[PDB]
Design a protein around this ligand. Structure first.
Ligand SMILES: *[B]([O])([O])C1=[C]C([N+](=O)[O-])=[C][C]=[C]1
Length: 358
C-alpha cells in the first residue's frame, strides 16, 4: 500500500486499539476504487489465532444495509412497492392500527414507535404475529423516527414473500452471489467455523445469540475482503451487471426522510459532503442514534446523491463495526473489530483517515 495510506492508517488505528483495548481488528481503505487491507491482533485470544483477511466478523446492524438493498432489488423486480400497505403482504395483520403503515414506514423506522428490540419471548411465527397485532403505536406513521430492529426486520421478512424464497435464500441468490461475496453468511457453515472470530464482552468470548428477525436485522457475518467489495459495489452501482441489483443499490441510497442534517435511506444513512465531523461523530453516540426524532419527508425522495457521506454502524454483544464511503471521491473505509467500543471513536477514526486522503 502507498506509504501515504499506510501511514494515515497506522497513525490512527494503533492508538484506537490501545485506548479501547480492542483484541482484533481488520480495516480496509478503498482508495480510487482499489482496496488496501490492514490487520491487527487476535480473532481468538485463547488459541492465539490472528486476524487475517479471511477472519469472519459479526456485522451487527451493518446487516441492515444488505436488507435495504435486497428490498431495493425486490422493488426493481416489481415484486413489491414501498407505497404498499403492510397488510398487503401479511393479510393476517388485522389490527386497525396497521391501516396506513406502508413498507416505506417499516424500512425507515417511521411506522410510529415500533420497538428497538423484538422481545426475547417472541419465538414462533405465531408469537411474532401476536406481538405486532398487540403493538400500540405512539405516533402517526411518517412523523417520528425511532431506530428499530422490529421495524426494518419486518420489512426484510415481508419484502421476500412474493419471491417464494426464504430470506437467507434470497439474500444469497440475489445479493451475495451476484456480487461475489463468497465469504458472507447469515448462518456460518461448519467448513467456515475455524475463521469465525470470537466477540469479546467484559473479557468473555461471545457470539451473537439467536433471535426473532435476527437474519433480517443484525445477522450477517463477513470478512474484510467481502466488505470491501460490498463498499465498492455501493460506491459505483452503475458498474454492477445485474439490472435490478444496480437499481436496488441506488434506491437504498435515496433520501426518504431528513432529521437534523441526516438523511434516511434503506438501511444506509447519509449526510451531505463535505460534512462537519461533529455532525456525524456526535450523532453516532447511542444516546442520539437511538432516540425519538421528528422527521421531514422528502417528497419525492432524492436519488442517490454522489456528494454524500454514506455510512452505518453495527454492533452485537462482542463486535463493533463501521462502514463509510464518499461516492464522489471513490473513497471508503471498513472497520471490523471483535469488541463493541464507542461509536464516536469509530466515526472519529474513519473521518481522520478519509479526510486525509481528500
Ligand atoms: B445494530 O447493531 O444497531 C443493533 C444490533 C442489535 N443486535 O442485537 O445485534 C440490536 C439493536 C441494534
Amino acid at each position: 500500500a502507498p506509504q501515504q495510506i499506510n501511514d494515515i492508517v497506522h497513525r490512527t488505528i494503533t492508538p484506537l486499539i490501545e485506548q479501547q483495548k480492542i483484541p482484533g481488528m481488520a480495516v480496509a481503505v478503498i482508495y480510487q476504487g482499489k482496496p488496501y487491507y490492514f490487520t491487527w491482533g487476535y480473532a481468538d485470544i485463547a488459541k492465539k489465532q490472528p486476524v487475517t483477511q479471511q477472519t469472519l466478523f459479526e456485522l451487527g446492524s451493518v446487516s441492515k444495509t444488505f436488507t435495504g438493498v435486497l428490498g431495493g432489488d425486490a422493488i426493481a423486480r416489481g415484486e413489491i412497492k414501498l407505497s404498499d400497505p403492510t397488510t398487503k403482504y401479511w393479510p393476517e395483520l388485522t389490527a386497525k392500527q396497521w391501516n396506513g403503515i406502508t413498507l416505506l414506514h417499516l424500512a425507515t423506522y417511521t411506522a410510529g414507535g415500533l420497538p428497538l428490540q423484538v422481545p426475547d419471548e417472541v419465538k414462533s411465527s405465531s408469537d411474532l404475529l401476536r406481538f405486532y397485532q398487540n403493538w400500540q403505536p405512539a405516533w402517526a406513521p411518517g412523523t417520528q423516527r425511532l431506530y428499530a430492529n422490529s421495524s426494518i426486520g419486518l420489512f426484510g421478512a415481508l419484502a421476500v414473500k412474493p419471491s417464494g424464497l426464504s430470506f437467507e435464500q434470497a439474500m444469497q441468490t440475489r445479493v451475495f452471489q451476484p456480487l461475489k461475496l463468497n465469504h458472507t453468511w447469515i448462518n456460518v457453515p461448519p467448513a467456515e467455523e475455524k475463521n469465525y472470530a470470537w466477540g469479546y464482552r467484559e473479557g468473555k468470548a461471545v457470539h451473537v445469540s439467536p433471535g426473532a428477525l435476527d437474519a433480517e436485522a443484525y445477522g450477517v457475518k463477513s470478512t474484510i475482503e467481502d466488505m470491501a467489495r460490498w463498499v465498492q459495489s455501493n460506491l459505483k452501482p452503475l458498474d454492477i451487471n445485474e439490472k435490478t441489483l444496480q437499481q436496488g443499490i441506488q434506491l437504498a441510497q435515496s433520501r426518504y426522510w431528513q432529521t437534523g442534517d441526516m438523511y434516511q435511506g434503506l438501511g444506509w444513512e447519509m449526510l451531505d459532503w463535505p460534512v462537519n465531523p461533529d455532525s456525524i461523530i456526535n450523532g453516532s453516540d447511542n444516546k442520539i442514534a437511538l432516540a425519538a426524532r421528528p422527521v421531514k419527508a422528502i417528497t419525492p425522495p432524492t436519488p442517490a446523491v454522489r456528494a454524500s457521506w454514506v455510512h452505518k454502524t453495527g454492533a452485537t454483544g462482542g463486535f463493533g463495526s463501521y462502514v463509510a464511503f464518499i461516492p464522489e471521491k471513490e473513497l471508503g473505509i471498513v472497520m471490523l473489530a471483535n469488541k463493541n467500543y464507542p461509536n464516536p471513536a469509530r466515526v472519529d477514526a474513519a473521518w481522520q483517515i478519509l479526510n486525509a486522503l481528500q
